[PDB]
Amino acid sequence: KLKLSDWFNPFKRPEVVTMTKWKAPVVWEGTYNRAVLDNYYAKQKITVGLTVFAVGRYIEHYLEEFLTSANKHFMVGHPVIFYIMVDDVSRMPLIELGPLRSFKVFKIKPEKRWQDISMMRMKTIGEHIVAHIQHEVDFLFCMDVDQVFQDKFGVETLGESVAQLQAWWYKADPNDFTYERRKESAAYIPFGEGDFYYHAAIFGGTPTQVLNITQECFKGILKDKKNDIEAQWHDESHLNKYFLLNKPTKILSPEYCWDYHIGLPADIKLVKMSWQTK
Amino acid sequence: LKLSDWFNPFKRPEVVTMTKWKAPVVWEGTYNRAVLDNYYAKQKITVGLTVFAVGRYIEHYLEEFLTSANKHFMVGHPVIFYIMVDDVSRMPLIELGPLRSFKVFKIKPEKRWQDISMMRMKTIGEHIVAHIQHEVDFLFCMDVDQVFQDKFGVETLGESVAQLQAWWYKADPNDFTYERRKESAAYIPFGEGDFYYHAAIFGGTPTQVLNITQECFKGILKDKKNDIEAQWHDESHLNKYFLLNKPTKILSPEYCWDYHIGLPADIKLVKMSWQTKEYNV
Numbered sequence: 001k002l003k004l005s006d007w008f009n010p011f012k013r014p015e016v017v018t019m020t021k022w023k024a025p026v027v028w029e030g031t032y033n034r035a036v037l038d039n040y041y042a043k044q045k046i047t048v049g050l051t052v053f054a055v056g057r058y059i060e061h062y063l064e065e066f067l068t069s070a071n072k073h074f075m076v077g078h079p080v081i082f083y084i085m086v087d088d089v090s091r092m093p094l095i096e097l098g099p100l101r102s103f104k105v106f107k108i109k110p111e112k113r114w115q116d117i118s119m120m121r122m123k124t125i126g127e128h129i130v131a132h133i134q135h136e137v138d139f140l141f142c143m144d145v146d147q148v149f150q151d152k153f154g155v156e157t158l159g160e161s162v163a164q165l166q167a168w169w170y171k172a173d174p175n176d177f178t179y180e181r182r183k184e185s186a187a188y189i190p191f192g193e194g195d196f197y198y199h200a201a202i203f204g205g206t207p208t209q210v211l212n213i214t215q216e217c218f219k220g221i222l223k224d225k226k227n228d229i230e231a232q233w234h235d236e237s238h239l240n241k242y243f244l245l246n247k248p249t250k251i252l253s254p255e256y257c258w259d260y261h262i263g264l265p266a267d268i269k270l271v272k273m274s275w276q277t278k
Numbered sequence: 279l280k281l282s283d284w285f286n287p288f289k290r291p292e293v294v295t296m297t298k299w300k301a302p303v304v305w306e307g308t309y310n311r312a313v314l315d316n317y318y319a320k321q322k323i324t325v326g327l328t329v330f331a332v333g334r335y336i337e338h339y340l341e342e343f344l345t346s347a348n349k350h351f352m353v354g355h356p357v358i359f360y361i362m363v364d365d366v367s368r369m370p371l372i373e374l375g376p377l378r379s380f381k382v383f384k385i386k387p388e389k390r391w392q393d394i395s396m397m398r399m400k401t402i403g404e405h406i407v408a409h410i411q412h413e414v415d416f417l418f419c420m421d422v423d424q425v426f427q428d429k430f431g432v433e434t435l436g437e438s439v440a441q442l443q444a445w446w447y448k449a450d451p452n453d454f455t456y457e458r459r460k461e462s463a464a465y466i467p468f469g470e471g472d473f474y475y476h477a478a479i480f481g482g483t484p485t486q487v488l489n490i491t492q493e494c495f496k497g498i499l500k501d502k503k504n505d506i507e508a509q510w511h512d513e514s515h516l517n518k519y520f521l522l523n524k525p526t527k528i529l530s531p532e533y534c535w536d537y538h539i540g541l542p543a544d545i546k547l548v549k550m551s552w553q554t555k556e557y558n559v
């Protein structure tokens with residue numbers, strides 16, 4: 001029974017978009033009250049889940065740093081469960097988790113093409129959601145492993161379906177977005193359409209919503225295959241297609257997934273997470 | 279939650295179902311897990327479980343303990359396995375099922391198995407204060423050299439839980455292997471004692487467990503200073519503690535049976551059995 005005006009103050013960040021045309025809030029540094037939210041959610045005793053895939057050298061190269069920084073910055077003060085999906089479990093790093101953090105490892109099959117490794121995540125996530133995640137967490141996030149938290153990534157990011165603004169295009173106009181522009185693809189988005197360009201490196205919401213998101217993207221990914229076509233940015237193309245039809249209830253600013261390669265403009269006040277120098 | 283709701287001793291008349299201080303003794307057939315699961319589910323309670331594996335005990339019992347726990351321990355409720363080992367690279371990563379999760383901790387290995395056993399008391403406490411108190415409603419501390427044979431459910435939860443030792447549940451208190459030397463802190467005089475509790479399983483709410491582990495380690499340290507060591511180590515201190523601070527619930531030998539004894543008519547359904555320690559032939 002939480003109201004937007006209870007934790008969100010868009011007037012703190014007037015230079016950027018704080019609200020979508022459909023009433024969905026865009027969380028920027030300085031517009032949220034994590035103190036209120038932490039109290040409100042704690043009273044509900046919610047549990048947050050976080051899925052992550054590490055296949056191949058992505059394990060030695062990123063998994064440890066991802067987990068160590070997540071244990072340190074992800075929803076601090078609230079129960080968290082990390083679902084590690086790897087192809088070689090005996091290579092997974094067992095870091096020491098802090099208060100309210102626990103994990104669970106799953107051995108998955110490694111896809112030959114790196115593209116399928118990225119896209120197959122959609123199918124796997126849905127299977128685990130149905131199998132157990134829906135019964136263990138109230139909110140779930142699905143992130144890339146080649147990222148690193150730099151600061152608090154709190155409950156101010158929770159919602160039915162949360163989307164992340166892609167660092168490079170958050171200020172570009174829709175007609176410039178790198179959407180899949182070929183009608184033969186299930187991810188096809190016609191010019192003159194589109195709200196924002198979402199990053200597939202971070203997305204989430206309630207187990208139910210994430211299931212629909214992952215289920216719908218996988219279908220489209222599968223359909224393109226039978227049609228011998230592949231979305232330009234793979235699952236990200238499908239994810240953007242999905243968020244167009246089913247708009248998110250909340251969007252995270254590029255501060256929750258910044259690419260230091262871009263530099264650090266005025267708009268980026270406090271980076272919560274950054275891309276790895278892959 | 280009233281005892282009348284789930285507990286019914288009329289089902290097992292041949293055995294003690296109630297202590298003198300009114301604590302119940304859970305036996306197969308006297309509990310209604312169905313009702314308790316409902317009450318406990320609505321409460322959104324999470325159950326914790328500590329376990330230690332140092333040296334050879336990792337390869338010989340850790341994997342079997344967790345696999346059987348993941349399958350039988352508090353099924354249908356959130357559970358967090360707390361694994362303490364001296365060598366993490368040997369930690370066997372088994373696939374956990376719905377409502378289970380865990381985290382491993384690297385602990386310093388002691389040079390005397392007796393110290394490994396007794397130190398668990400100190401380590402468990404430090405972890406209760408550090409994080410366990412903030413993650414679970416009930417916690418269980420078990421030996422690793424055992425395996426779950428069947429459902430070990432919420433019918434075992436309570437403020438402070440004690441396990442009856444399979445070999446003496448029918449023995450005379452004066453035959454118990456309590457520490458009989460008055461120079462030891464674990465000392466229990468002849469003519470005193472209710473039951474002989476198995477240190478292999480014990481639990482309760484984090485707070486209670488913290489007190490149990492704190493008081494036992496204190497006794498252990500005091501003995502080290504008086505150059506004396508309880509004949510049954512931490513188990514001796516635990517019995518002494520459970521004598522002074524009687525538990526709110528007790529588990530029949532069915533929750534921790536030794537097949538070497540065979541299988542008398544009292545053990546209706548084994549929930550957990552001891553793992554063998556040596557290959558005798």
Ligand SMILES: O=c1ccn([C@@H]2O[C@H](COP(=O)(O)OP(=O)(O)O[C@H]3O[C@H](CO)[C@H](O)[C@H](O)[C@H]3F)[C@@H](O)[C@H]2O)c(=O)[nH]1
Nearest residue numbers: 053054055056058114117118144145146200201234235236
């Ligand atoms: O060899 C690999 C390749 C990929 N991955 C997994 O797939 C994710 C995405 O792959 P990349 O990081 O290589 O892709 P990129 O940084 O280009 O990411 C963007 O584009 C991808 C599709 O190309 C996805 O949509 C992704 O979510 C989006 F952030 C990784 O984080 C990782 O969890 C592996 O585990 N091993």
Ligand SMILES: O=c1ccn([C@@H]2O[C@H](COP(=O)(O)OP(=O)(O)O[C@H]3O[C@H](CO)[C@H](O)[C@H](O)[C@H]3F)[C@@H](O)[C@H]2O)c(=O)[nH]1
Nearest residue numbers: 330331332333335391394395421422423477478511512513
């Ligand atoms: O080399 C060892 C020896 C012991 N332990 C740990 O200490 C526990 C207790 O040791 P044992 O199982 O070897 O002892 P035992 O079966 O004789 O157990 C009884 O006596 C013990 C003290 O001797 C404890 O009180 C214990 O709880 C009680 F059940 C083990 O399960 C294990 O978790 C190890 O990890 N490595």
Ligand SMILES: [Mn+2]
Nearest residue numbers: 144145146201
């Ligand atoms: Mn990436």
Ligand SMILES: [Mn+2]
Nearest residue numbers: 421422423478
């Ligand atoms: Mn033992």
